[PDB]
Amino acid sequence: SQKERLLDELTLEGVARYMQSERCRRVICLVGAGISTSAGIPDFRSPSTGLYDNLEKYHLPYPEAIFEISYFKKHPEPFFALAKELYPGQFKPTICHYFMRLLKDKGLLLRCYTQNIDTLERIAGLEQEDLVEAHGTFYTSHCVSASCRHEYPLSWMKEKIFSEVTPKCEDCQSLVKPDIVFFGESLPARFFSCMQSDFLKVDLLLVMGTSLQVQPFASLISKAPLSTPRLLINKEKAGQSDPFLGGMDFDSKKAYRDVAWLGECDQGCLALAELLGWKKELEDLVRREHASIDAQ
């Protein structure tokens, strides 16, 4: 924990040169709902388009209740109504998603830690060895009673949601819940097992589309060694320490390794790929995979 400066300049161009130097072998991405908004899944805290500005109609106490396990156990219907409203007709990962697929294909991706539940990382070609779905997934669902715990695929959970029938276990008639980690629930064991080992060896943190306002996910940025560069690609800055409360430091006089590239995640990953000589690879990959999905 000695603060050395490994980037020759605190810019995207400097990150790029660093990524193609020998020091940079193991990349961890930390991603949130910002990387899937351009796919038609709204985020939470964007004013106007975010979910928190769009929950008046669910008769809830307050907005946050619809993502709390307690409230869900009492009343699962609002969440499942919300689920129907948000369920996209087509699952098409973004440029940002395929950028992380490129890191994998190039041997650079040590892990992607995602707060998203939309499965778009899997569809882009990230495999369980690449992925920590820190807040679970809609891909599988389980009977909640410590008894059945029987598993149902997304195909079955989707039908329940669209036919507006609350999912019950065929074997025990208990409620069937998407494998999502609600607020107040414990994160999967794989989250902790990976983070204890992944952050000993990481050479670059790539943080994309997340307000870094959910714990313990947001604490991941402080797990990297102090000389590990950290690039944020996001609409606005995030992860700086409150002036009253190892946060991000892009702007202070002591800034030495944090870089904030401000804009759309799709645009930031495009710009980074160009610097890397990957732009055509990335365009070809996105066009081919979107074409394949468009023809499903």
Partner: peptide, 6 residues
């Protein structure tokens, strides 16, 4: 610990 806000 548990998934929390703030």
């Amino acid at each position: 610990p548990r998934k929390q806000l703030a």
